[PDB]
Every structure is written in C-alpha cells, then in structure tokens.
Write a protein that binds this ligand. Structure first.
Ligand SMILES: N=C(N)N[C@@H]1CCCCNC(=O)[C@H](CCCCN)NC(=O)[C@H](CCCCN)NC(=O)Cc2cccc(c2)CNC(=O)CCNC1=O
Lengths: 39, 161
C-alpha cells in the first residue's frame, strides 16, 4: 500500500564510463497499452 | 521532498521494502514510467505526490506538474544509462543506441539488461540532460533485452483564464 520515493543521487554524465551493448535495429509495434512487440 | 535528482520508487507492505522502479525529480515534478506506479499516488517523506499527467501508451507518468524533460537523443551519439538497480549503487553505463523502427518513426533503443526495478532510470546525453527513461522494451530471440529511450513531450504552458 505504501509506495514512496527515496533519493538515490545526482544525475550526471560519468566521464570515464564503462561501455557495453550492441546497437540492434529492430522492427517493432507499439500498441495502445504501451506494449512494444517485435514484428 | 522535491529536490532534483534520481530517486528509487519503493513499496512497503508488512515486511520491509521492495524497489519497484526509479524516477527523476526535475523542476519540482517527479517523472517515472507508468508501469512502475500504475499511475497511483506516491509518498515523499511526510508529503503526498499526486499524479498530474500520464499516458499509458508512452508508459510515462508525472507527479506534481506536467512532464518537464525535453531533451532528445541526437541519434548519433553514445548515451549513458544512469542505472539505479534494486539494492545497488547508482552506476553509469555508456552505450551506442540501436533503433526501434516503428510505422510512426524511429525510436532510440539501448541494449542494456537490468533488474525490473531499474525501470524509470534516466538515460543521459553528454550534457547530463535526461533524454528518456529506461525500461519499456522487448526481449529478442536469445533472451536479452532492449529498452526504448522513452521520452515525454514538454508541452507549452497552458493559457490562463
Ligand atoms: N527479459 C529480460 N532479459 N530483461 C528484463 C528487463 C526489464 C527491465 C525493466 N523493464 C520491465 O520490467 C518492463 C515492464 C513492462 C513494460 C510493459 N510496457 N518489461 C519489458 O520491457 C519486457 C517486455 C517484453 C515484451 C512485451 N511485448 N518484459 C520482460 O523482459 C519480462 C521478461 C521476459 C522474459 C524473462 C524475464 C522477464 C525474466 N527475467 C527477470 O525477471 C530478470 C529481470 N530482467 C527483465 O525483466
């Protein structure tokens, strides 16, 4: 029942950050309920 | 409180608390993903935050005022996810976005996979501006995850009578 927020930090870009992840290009549909699905 | 920054969104039942998501306080407005709060009210310290604007299709909700975050991915540049995972320190991870191609246009998308309660974590450009929130995405064939860079519209001020 009790949903609450607690601060977790400042928002900053980190200068020497770890880099990861590829850059996929995906065909997707977005429905009226906010669901993305692959086409 | 409404001091700027990134916040965890927690739920408490009978035993202890669970982190269900993350959101961004900016200009006195709290920004998070709809699936984190289901559009319900939030407590901040002793104060209540009431939903103000939201859109389940964008999977976004703002509290106390209209959506304030208006920076967009430029397309070409790397971005950072300022991930705030349950039970862990906030950490930045840098990545070059891919693309969700939709019938209505392209959406930047990050191939970064974090616990569900990381939903709402901000994605940043190199100026530290929030260009979207993490956590509305798809699972591709090998089970890994790709999140849209989900950003709301900062509307012009509403007229006054
Ligand atoms: N699956 C991952 N590799 N990572 C995801 C990352 C989640 C990041 C934060 N975002 C969300 O929680 C949102 C909420 C719904 C928004 C809806 N508007 N969820 C999604 O965007 C996709 C939507 C898929 C397409 C819908 N057509 N749902 C999942 O991924 C659920 C899923 C699927 C298979 C297996 C699992 C969990 C089991 N893993 C775990 O429990 C470990 C945790 N990691 C995960 O949950």
């Amino acid at each position: 029942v009790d949903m609450y927020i607690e601060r977790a930090g400042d928002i900053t870009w980190e200068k020497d950050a770890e880099v990861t992840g590829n850059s996929p290009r995906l065909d997707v549909a977005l429905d009226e309920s906010g669901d993305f699905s692959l086409v | 409180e409404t001091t700027d920054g990134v916040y965890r969104v927690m739920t408490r039942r009978l035993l202890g608390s669970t982190q269900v998501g993350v959101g961004v306080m900016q200009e006195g407005v709290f920004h998070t993903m709809w699936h984190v709060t289901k559009g319900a009210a939030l407590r901040s310290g002793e104060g209540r935050l009431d939903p103000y604007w939201g859109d389940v299709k964008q999977d976004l909700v703002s509290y106390c005022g209209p959506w304030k975050l208006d920076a967009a991915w430029d397309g070409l540049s790397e971005v950072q996810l300022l991930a705030v995972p349950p039970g862990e320190r906030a950490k930045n991870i840098q990545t070059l976005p891919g693309i969700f191609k939709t019938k209505d246009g392209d959406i930047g998308a990050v191939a970064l996979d974090y616990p569900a309660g990381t939903s709402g974590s901000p994605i940043l450009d190199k100026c530290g501006r929030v260009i979207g929130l993490y956590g509305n995405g798809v699972v591709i064939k090998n089970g890994s995850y790709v999140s849209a860079i989900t950003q709301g519209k900062r509307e012009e001020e509403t007229p006054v009578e």
